[PDB]
Design a protein around this motif. Structure first.
Motif, PDB file in Angstrom:
ATOM      1  N   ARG A 154      -7.302   4.161  -1.387  1.00 37.38           N
ATOM      2  CA  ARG A 154      -6.367   3.125  -1.790  1.00 37.38           C
ATOM      3  C   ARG A 154      -6.652   1.804  -1.073  1.00 37.38           C
ATOM      4  O   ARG A 154      -6.472   0.720  -1.638  1.00 37.38           O
ATOM      5  N   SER A 155      -7.113   1.906   0.170  1.00 33.02           N
ATOM      6  CA  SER A 155      -7.362   0.735   1.002  1.00 33.02           C
ATOM      7  C   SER A 155      -8.810   0.282   0.913  1.00 33.02           C
ATOM      8  O   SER A 155      -9.225  -0.625   1.637  1.00 33.02           O
ATOM      9  N   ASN A 156      -9.568   0.924   0.033  1.00 29.46           N
ATOM     10  CA  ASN A 156     -10.972   0.594  -0.170  1.00 29.46           C
ATOM     11  C   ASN A 156     -11.790   0.793   1.099  1.00 29.46           C
ATOM     12  O   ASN A 156     -12.625  -0.039   1.452  1.00 29.46           O
ATOM     13  N   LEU A 168       0.813  -1.215   0.000  1.00 32.88           N
ATOM     14  CA  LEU A 168       0.000   0.000   0.000  1.00 32.88           C
ATOM     15  C   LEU A 168       0.852   1.273   0.000  1.00 32.88           C
ATOM     16  O   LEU A 168       0.385   2.340  -0.382  1.00 32.88           O
TER      17      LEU A 168
HETATM   18  C1  LIG Z   1      -8.977  -2.485  -3.340  1.00 35.10           C
HETATM   19  O1  LIG Z   1      -9.861  -3.022  -4.329  1.00 35.10           O
HETATM   20  C2  LIG Z   1      -9.236  -3.264  -5.599  1.00 35.10           C
HETATM   21  C3  LIG Z   1     -10.323  -3.730  -6.539  1.00 35.10           C
HETATM   22  O2  LIG Z   1     -10.618  -5.106  -6.339  1.00 35.10           O
HETATM   23  C4  LIG Z   1      -8.115  -4.286  -5.435  1.00 35.10           C
HETATM   24  O3  LIG Z   1      -7.456  -4.475  -6.683  1.00 35.10           O
HETATM   25  C5  LIG Z   1      -7.116  -3.806  -4.390  1.00 35.10           C
HETATM   26  O4  LIG Z   1      -6.144  -4.819  -4.154  1.00 35.10           O
HETATM   27  C6  LIG Z   1      -7.831  -3.471  -3.083  1.00 35.10           C
HETATM   28  N1  LIG Z   1      -6.891  -2.939  -2.109  1.00 35.10           N
HETATM   29  C7  LIG Z   1      -6.758  -3.438  -0.876  1.00 35.10           C
HETATM   30  C8  LIG Z   1      -5.740  -2.769  -0.003  1.00 35.10           C
HETATM   31  O5  LIG Z   1      -7.431  -4.386  -0.482  1.00 35.10           O
END
Ligand SMILES: *[C@@H]1O[C@H](CO)[C@@H](O)[C@H](O)[C@H]1NC(C)=O
Ligand SMILES: *[C@@H]1O[C@H](CO)[C@@H](O[C@@H]2O[C@H](CO)[C@@H](O)[C@H](O)[C@H]2NC(C)=O)[C@H](O)[C@H]1NC(C)=O
Lengths: 189, 13, 180
Positions: free
Chosen positions: C74-76, A52
């Protein structure tokens, strides 16, 4: 209030060894308790701690002016701030106050616990030892450990479990950076 | 003396 | 190492709370009052020996706020996990009847940095002379906090520090009463 919380947190650490002879600067970025990117002056570039943080490590590493700001931080920030606060932080010394009082491990039984209270001191490092008739007693000693009072003072309780006999003299001995000779307090049965 | 601030940077948008 | 100086800052949503502080070997040097936009020295005398431009702190908080929006996307929109605190009540020094002392409520190892703390005397909220610190950093990135209550030790009075945190199901009370 059960709404989700989102926390953005950043620290910059200055580590000093031998005064300011050796200094290390560490900048850290966190999101929700997860450290995801850092700048370590040992390296001189940002590094992703988690995936991240990778976009920011790459982005910030592409900014040479930002990097050189950070590369100089051990001087312009760490050594600078050290000097600013030196007189009332590094050189801060407060003598411990030492008292001894008896207590009990078991309320129904007799006093069998000598408490050496060492309080109000600064800095944190302390050494407390118990003596019986001038002989060091290392057995039956238990402590609170070092207690921080959150106000630039510390304290500790160091307790000796013992069965006092008439005529016995117990001594609590305290070493601390504020003194060059140990502080002692006697307690007589 | 005056304490210096480490100025945080904005992440990649 | 000999010494460590830490500058620590955060911004928290949806509370819109922010903090900026400096730490020396575990003690707070100062923090910035976001409302008054002023430097608050941990010990009053510090302000006579040094100074600080609070605008630098305000600028960092705005950055923290911008970085939060970026990271939350970014972390949804993953929310922080509540970590409930450990609470310890102690006195500033050994207690003697009718000899002025200070109760200390040490709130430790928690996140997010949001807490409600109440001093209770015989079950009643007390606010006379109370004071507190801001949220202090830990090496494990959880937080510390101190609350204080000056008091006159007596045999009739009992005290509790009551701490509310989203990680707790019910308020946590830690007790103090005269040791006999
Ligand atoms: C957030 O969602 C996207 C879409 O599926 C994914 O590619 C990404 O890995 C996710 N990020 C986290 C930190 O889970
Ligand atoms: C600290 O106390 C405040 C006030 O009781 C809490 O905030 C309240 O939360 C309820 C929902 O649980 C809202 O309806 C109120 O409007 C809030 N009060 C305000 C905004 O003044 C807060 O949740 C408590 N904090 C913790 C960590 O327990």
């Amino acid at each position: 209030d059960t709404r989700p919380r989102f926390l953005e947190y950043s620290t910059s650490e200055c580590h000093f060894f031998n005064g300011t002879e050796r200094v290390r600067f560490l900048e850290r970025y966190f999101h929700n308790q997860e450290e995801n990117v850092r700048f370590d002056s040992d390296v001189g570039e940002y590094r992703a701690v988690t995936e991240l943080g990778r976009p920011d490590a790459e982005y910030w590493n592409s900014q040479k002016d930002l990097l050189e700001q950070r590369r100089a931080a051990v001087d312009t920030y760490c050594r600078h701030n050290y000097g600013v606060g030196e007189s009332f932080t590094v050189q801060r010394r407060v003598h411990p106050k030492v008292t001894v009082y008896p207590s009990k491990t078991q309320p129904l039984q007799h006093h069998n616990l000598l408490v050496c209270s060492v309080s109000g001191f600064y800095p944190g490092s302390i050494e407390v030892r118990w003596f019986r008739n001038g002989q060091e007693e290392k057995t039956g000693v238990v402590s609170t450990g070092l207690i921080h009072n959150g106000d630039w003072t510390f304290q500790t309780l160091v307790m000796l479990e013992t069965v006092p006999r008439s005529g016995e003299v117990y001594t609590c001995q305290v070493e601390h950076p504020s003194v060059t000779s140990p502080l002692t307090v006697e307690w007589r049965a | 003396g005056v304490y210096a601030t480490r100025s945080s940077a904005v992440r990649l948008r | 190492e000999e010494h460590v100086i830490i500058q620590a800052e955060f911004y928290l949503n949806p509370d819109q709370s922010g903090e900026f502080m400096f730490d020396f070997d575990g003690d707070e040097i100062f923090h910035v009052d976001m409302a008054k936009k002023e430097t608050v020295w941990r010990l009053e005398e510090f302000g006579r020996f040094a100074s600080f431009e609070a605008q630098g702190a305000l600028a960092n908080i705005a950055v923290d706020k911008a970085n939060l929006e970026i990271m939350t996307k970014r972390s949804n929109y993953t929310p922080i996990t509540n970590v409930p605190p450990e609470v310890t009540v102690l006195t500033n020094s050994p207690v003697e009847l009718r000899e002025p002392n200070v109760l200390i409520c040490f709130i430790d190892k928690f996140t997010p940095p949001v807490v409600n703390v109440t001093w209770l005397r015989n079950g009643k909220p007390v606010t006379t002379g109370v004071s507190e610190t801001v949220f202090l950093p830990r090496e494990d990135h959880l937080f510390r906090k101190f609350h204080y209550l000056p008091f006159l030790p007596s045999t009739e009075d009992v005290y509790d520090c009551r701490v509310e945190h989203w990680g707790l199901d019910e308020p946590l009370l830690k007790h103090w009463e005269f040791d006999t």
